[PDB]
Amino acid sequence: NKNTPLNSGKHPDLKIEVAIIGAGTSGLYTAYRLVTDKKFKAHDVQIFDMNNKLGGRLESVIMPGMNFWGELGGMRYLTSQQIVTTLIEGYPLSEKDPNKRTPVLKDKMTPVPFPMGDPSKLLMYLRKERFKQNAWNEAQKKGEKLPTRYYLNENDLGFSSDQLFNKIIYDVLMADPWVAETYGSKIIKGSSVYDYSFKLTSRDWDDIKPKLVYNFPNSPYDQRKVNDIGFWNLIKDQVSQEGYEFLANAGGYYSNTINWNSAEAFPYMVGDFSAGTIYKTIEEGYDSIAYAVANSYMEHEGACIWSENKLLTFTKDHPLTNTHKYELTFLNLKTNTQWKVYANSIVLAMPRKSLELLDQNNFFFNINKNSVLNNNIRSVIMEPAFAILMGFEYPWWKELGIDSGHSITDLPMRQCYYFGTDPETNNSMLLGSYGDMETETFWKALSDDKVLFEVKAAKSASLRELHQLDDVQATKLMVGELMNQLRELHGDTVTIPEPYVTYFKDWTDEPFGAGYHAWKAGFSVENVMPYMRKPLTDEQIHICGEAYSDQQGWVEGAFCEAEKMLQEYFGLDRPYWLSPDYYLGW
Amino acid sequence: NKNTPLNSGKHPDLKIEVAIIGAGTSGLYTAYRLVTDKKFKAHDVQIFDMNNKLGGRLESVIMPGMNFWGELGGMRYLTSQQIVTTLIEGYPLSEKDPNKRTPVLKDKMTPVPFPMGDPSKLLMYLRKERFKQNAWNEAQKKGEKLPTRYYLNENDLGFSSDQLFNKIIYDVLMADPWVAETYGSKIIKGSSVYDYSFKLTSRDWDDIKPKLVYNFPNSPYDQRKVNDIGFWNLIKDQVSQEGYEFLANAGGYYSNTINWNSAEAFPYMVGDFSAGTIYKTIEEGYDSIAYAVANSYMEHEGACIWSENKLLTFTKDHPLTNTHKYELTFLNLKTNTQWKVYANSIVLAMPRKSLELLDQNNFFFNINKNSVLNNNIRSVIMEPAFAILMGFEYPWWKELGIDSGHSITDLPMRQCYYFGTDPETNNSMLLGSYGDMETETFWKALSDDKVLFEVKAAKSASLRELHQLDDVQATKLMVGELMNQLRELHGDTVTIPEPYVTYFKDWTDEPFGAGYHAWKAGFSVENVMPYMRKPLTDEQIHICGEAYSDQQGWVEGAFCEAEKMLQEYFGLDRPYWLSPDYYLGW
Numbered sequence A, B: 001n002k003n004t005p006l007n008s009g010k011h012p013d014l015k016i017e018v019a020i021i022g023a024g025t026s027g028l029y030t031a032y033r034l035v036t037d038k039k040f041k042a043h044d045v046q047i048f049d050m051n052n053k054l055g056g057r058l059e060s061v062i063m064p065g066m067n068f069w070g071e072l073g074g075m076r077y078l079t080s081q082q083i084v085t086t087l088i089e090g091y092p093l094s095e096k097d098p099n100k101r102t103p104v105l106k107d108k109m110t111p112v113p114f115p116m117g118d119p120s121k122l123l124m125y126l127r128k129e130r131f132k133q134n135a136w137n138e139a140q141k142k143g144e145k146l147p148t149r150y151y152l153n154e155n156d157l158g159f160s161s162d163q164l165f166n167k168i169i170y171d172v173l174m175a176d177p178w179v180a181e182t183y184g185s186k187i188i189k190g191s192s193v194y195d196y197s198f199k200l201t202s203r204d205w206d207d208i209k210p211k212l213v214y215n216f217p218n219s220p221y222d223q224r225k226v227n228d229i230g231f232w233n234l235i236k237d238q239v240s241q242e243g244y245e246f247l248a249n250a251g252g253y254y255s256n257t258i259n260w261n262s263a264e265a266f267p268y269m270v271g272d273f274s275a276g277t278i279y280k281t282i283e284e285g286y287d288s289i290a291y292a293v294a295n296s297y298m299e300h301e302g303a304c305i306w307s308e309n310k311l312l313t314f315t316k317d318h319p320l321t322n323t324h325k326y327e328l329t330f331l332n333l334k335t336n337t338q339w340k341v342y343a344n345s346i347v348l349a350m351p352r353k354s355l356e357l358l359d360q361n362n363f364f365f366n367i368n369k370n371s372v373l374n375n376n377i378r379s380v381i382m383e384p385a386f387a388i389l390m391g392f393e394y395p396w397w398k399e400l401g402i403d404s405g406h407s408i409t410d411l412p413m414r415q416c417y418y419f420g421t422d423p424e425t426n427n428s429m430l431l432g433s434y435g436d437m438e439t440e441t442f443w444k445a446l447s448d449d450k451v452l453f454e455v456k457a458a459k460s461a462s463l464r465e466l467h468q469l470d471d472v473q474a475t476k477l478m479v480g481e482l483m484n485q486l487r488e489l490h491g492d493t494v495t496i497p498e499p500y501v502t503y504f505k506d507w508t509d510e511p512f513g514a515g516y517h518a519w520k521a522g523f524s525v526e527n528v529m530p531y532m533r534k535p536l537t538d539e540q541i542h543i544c545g546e547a548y549s550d551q552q553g554w555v556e557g558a559f560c561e562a563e564k565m566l567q568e569y570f571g572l573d574r575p576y577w578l579s580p581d582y583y584l585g586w
């Protein structure tokens, strides 16, 4: 299923209609929709990627001794994300029996719940105090306010990060009298001082985000749109810098407390409501969604993914202006030779860093001409991520009654996910994932070191099998220091043995430069998104993907931006399998 | 004296020997030494800068109502920095009667001691606890260990940041048996648990830094060169993450605690031993040293600083290869037109960001040829800095008995300097913050906002005078939030009135991309420095300046790298006025 053919060759002066650059989720989805709806024959729609793999930031791996998929990138989806959920599960989403679902893609994909674990057993390790994640709720059940080594404002004492986040967003929303009046029925103060909940929909958030005013009379930010305030600016203002320190650390990496757009951060933090929805993954690896869309595209005659082929530049000044608006110059990495593709539409299905790495002197990127394009490319923050998969001969975490889920710390490692145990071998997988709150610089000095971790034999994992992964091992300095932090996080009551295998991915590396993106304060997001899907009025050049999506951090963001671009400029209707009530904006 | 002529015009096909690109301290010093020692006629040595002023990261300003110089960039020097000190004060430095000193530069420069303030009155505000900076010493005088809201290891309890830093460096030095044996006499444990001191010289540090081994058998970093360990990596290892949090926040700007080269950080923290030396500035503004060096150069007929002229690219492939190795293409910013200069030597007197903004496709930078150059350009961290100068109608800080010096906080502002009061007007100047790497994103969302602070009339400061500075005002959001943090830092015992004028510079802006630079762990600094002063053996192309100096953060670093380059490639001797015992390395 994951052996989708990739062509590392070239075809000098190939003449097509639509060049898609990026074999990530948005680029694959674009090519799949175009050929499946028969807008073009598959030989006129071609995908190019510089990688030796399709999928981009989805990359599922199997490590010797562990007969289940680890994730280097994307792990999971939410069933409220209708494009990715329908593509995985079939339709309609109402149908609760998976056997009565109608598949959209042929590839077998087994949806399984994402294990979230037990707050009673999962750890929070902050300023050297070891808590269970439920510690705040247990105190509140006994009429107590849990003390921490953070000096919160007095009115926040005993709040958890979840509860305090909810109270902040509630307070900011309800202080805007227009929001209070129009949406108060969906912004809910429960009975307990700690209980705040939201029933605001995607549609509601789209009405709110551009209008919401910060109404706090002696704040520095008073009477400004929440859109124009950084989320760290806004959190400090509401709960003091000690409050920000608490939320930034206790939130974890899945929680986004960088100084990004506060209007956009609000829905990110409290969800687009329909709370029958849960986190799931794919038994065969989350990258299966990319392989399934790619294979659906590749089953049409003339379909081709050109791998190890890097776009350098593109021009309107070429010999074939009579048949083709654009000449694209690709670098065939295997031969180090340049070749030309001729096309009438270009889809840049790639993030901010990838755009910046293209020739900035051509007609499209030239900053002397297209100052608006360049400003809007710079409208999103490139948030670093690293993934380190570690294989142990046994699940040492079970000694603490931990099955699954995430432990969270202010230590530089930030967070570990206890991924699974192979019931035959007992070999067990931990994910370390980090990058936020300055931890990139801590880890970069260690991951840049030249001396690699050496693989070690375990059950069903021979040196010959493991030596195939020599190249993708973490550094010994990074493994040693992470092991040190895991011992401090879990405490002295559990012995943590050395791992036998690791897998390391740095998503800051070119061409990605980021794990995910975040809208900056002070940009009109509702206007930048349509702009990015077709920057120049007289050019059939489109940007799509997660980076300029309004579901940043998510495959659904990449799919939604591609889908909007398809319906706007490629004359496609909503897919039959996609509910018309799934909101995609203007 | 600061009206040094700048030529914003062009001279198509100008034919010279030495093109210096960067009218910063190093570029000015290069041009001054070359023409003063008559290595070249002044018409054959030309300086080019894209700015509309000389000085680079030295920029002194006067604000209406305040009849003294504020500093946007460099502020002060140490009398152990012999090039900058001799240039300012005259020679020799042994002569302690200033009337028996022989001036080196004619421009009037009045050295005045840098006011350091009173640790009894200066504030430290950490995790919401307000201390006087002397609090740790006062506790130690009463036999006590000052408690803080940081959970230090038990062996560090009651230590100040200074004392704990000294202990860390002592412990690491003395654990290397070769360092213990060879240099133990200069690495001194005093009687009190808190007392550690060093008599290691510039020369001693140059022997030590490349050899020093981290000898800690339980550490992840054991048996690695201290050179190969990030300073945050090393500090956490020695005093725990809570210890790093204490040092990073309590240190201030005086401390560099980013994850940079530990071998280089050691002397940065504990000095090149040479006590009796103090901090000074120049009454006429610290940028006076730049104007003095520039004017000495510009006294020669044919000398020219080409301002508002930006180097784009340079090539060996041009019509005049018989007389001139290199053709330089400059962009004349006033006309947006390109012009050519022909030269046999190129001096890039510019930081990392400036080099990266040049054409990366030419013979020199092209990564297909010179991957080694590119790796060495990336050997230093670009540390962000900004400057916000604020003018108040009175020195509100005097209510707390504060004359001068720095308050330090874990609030995002990090540090403020109480600068001066105009005794006629009483209008008084704060340097609000430089921000830093951690806090760049907190402040950037506010400084990028479009609504600028509105100037307000004060004594000897009319609206018409102030409206000339409309362009360089901080944003309302940045001024309001900094004022909020100043109120929290100082407490409710002082009322802080609104400022009437501000001055904002962001040193992350192109072409600087940094306030200062920091060597990365894992680079052989002793080998990169000589490499950068002449990267290619067959080319008369040189890099000098602070960025690849071993006195990063300092004018002295820029002067020393220019001086070494001059003695190595341009046939100059040490200047007559520079003591032969001033160590300048290999």
Ligand SMILES: Cc1cc2nc3c(=O)[nH]c(=O)nc-3n(C[C@H](O)[C@H](O)[C@H](O)COP(=O)(O)OP(=O)(O)OC[C@H]3O[C@@H](n4cnc5c(N)ncnc54)[C@H](O)[C@@H]3O)c2cc1C
Binding pocket: A021, A022, A023, A024, A025, A026, A027, A048, A049, A050, A051, A054, A055, A056, A057, A058, A072, A073, A074, A075, A076, A077, A309, A310, A311, A312, A349, A350, A351, A354, A355, A358, A385, A386, A387, A507, A511, A512, A514, A515, A516, A544, A545, A546, A547, A553, A554, A555, A556, A557, A558
């Ligand atoms: C650590 C991590 C965790 C994540 N977790 C989740 C999660 O749990 N759930 C989820 O739904 N999402 C998650 N995501 C996000 C998800 O992986 C991405 O949003 C999505 O995969 C991005 O799709 P895209 O189309 O933007 O392209 P990308 O995946 O960014 O792919 C872009 C492609 O363009 C190629 N390219 C760039 N420049 C060129 C060039 N010049 N020539 C040729 N090819 C070029 C690249 O090689 C790449 O294949 C996560 C991301 C990361 C990093």
Ligand SMILES: Cc1cc2nc3c(=O)[nH]c(=O)nc-3n(C[C@H](O)[C@H](O)[C@H](O)COP(=O)(O)OP(=O)(O)OC[C@H]3O[C@@H](n4cnc5c(N)ncnc54)[C@H](O)[C@@H]3O)c2cc1C
Binding pocket: B021, B022, B023, B024, B025, B026, B027, B048, B049, B050, B051, B054, B055, B056, B057, B058, B072, B073, B074, B075, B076, B077, B309, B310, B311, B312, B349, B350, B351, B354, B355, B358, B385, B386, B387, B434, B507, B511, B512, B514, B515, B516, B544, B545, B546, B547, B553, B554, B555, B556, B557, B558
């Ligand atoms: C906030 C702050 C505080 C500081 N405090 C002190 C202090 O108290 N004492 C001290 O001694 N040092 C201090 N420093 C450092 C000191 O200011 C610098 O180390 C020093 O001025 C750097 O000089 P340089 O020769 O490296 O060049 P720079 O100052 O970096 O000048 C480089 C020049 O190159 C030009 N340039 C770049 N690219 C091009 C191009 N393509 N074409 C043409 N021109 C180009 C730029 O316009 C610029 O003028 C401070 C720095 C900052 C930011």
Ligand SMILES: NC(=[NH2+])NCCC[C@H](N)C(=O)O
Binding pocket: B253, B254, B256, B268, B383, B516, B517, B518, B552, B553, B554
């Ligand atoms: N390693 C560095 N460059 N540190 C920057 C510190 C600030 C600089 N020394 C100054 O005097 O303001």
